[PDB]
Amino acid sequence: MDPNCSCSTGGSCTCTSSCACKNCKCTSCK
Numbered sequence: 001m002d003p004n005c006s007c008s009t010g011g012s013c014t015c016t017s018s019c020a021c022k023n024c025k026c027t028s029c030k
């Protein structure tokens with residue numbers, strides 16, 4: 001059902017020096 005994050009759906013989300021989610025599937029997260 002995806003229970004880990006809520007970032008949105010379109011082209012780009014950012015994720016740089018500090019994150020406010022649990023782990024995520026993005027660039028340095030997994």
Ligand SMILES: [Cd+2]
Nearest residue numbers: 005007021024
């Ligand atoms: Cd996230």
Ligand SMILES: [Cd+2]
Nearest residue numbers: 007013015026
């Ligand atoms: Cd993200």
Ligand SMILES: [Cd+2]
Nearest residue numbers: 015019024029
């Ligand atoms: Cd993240």
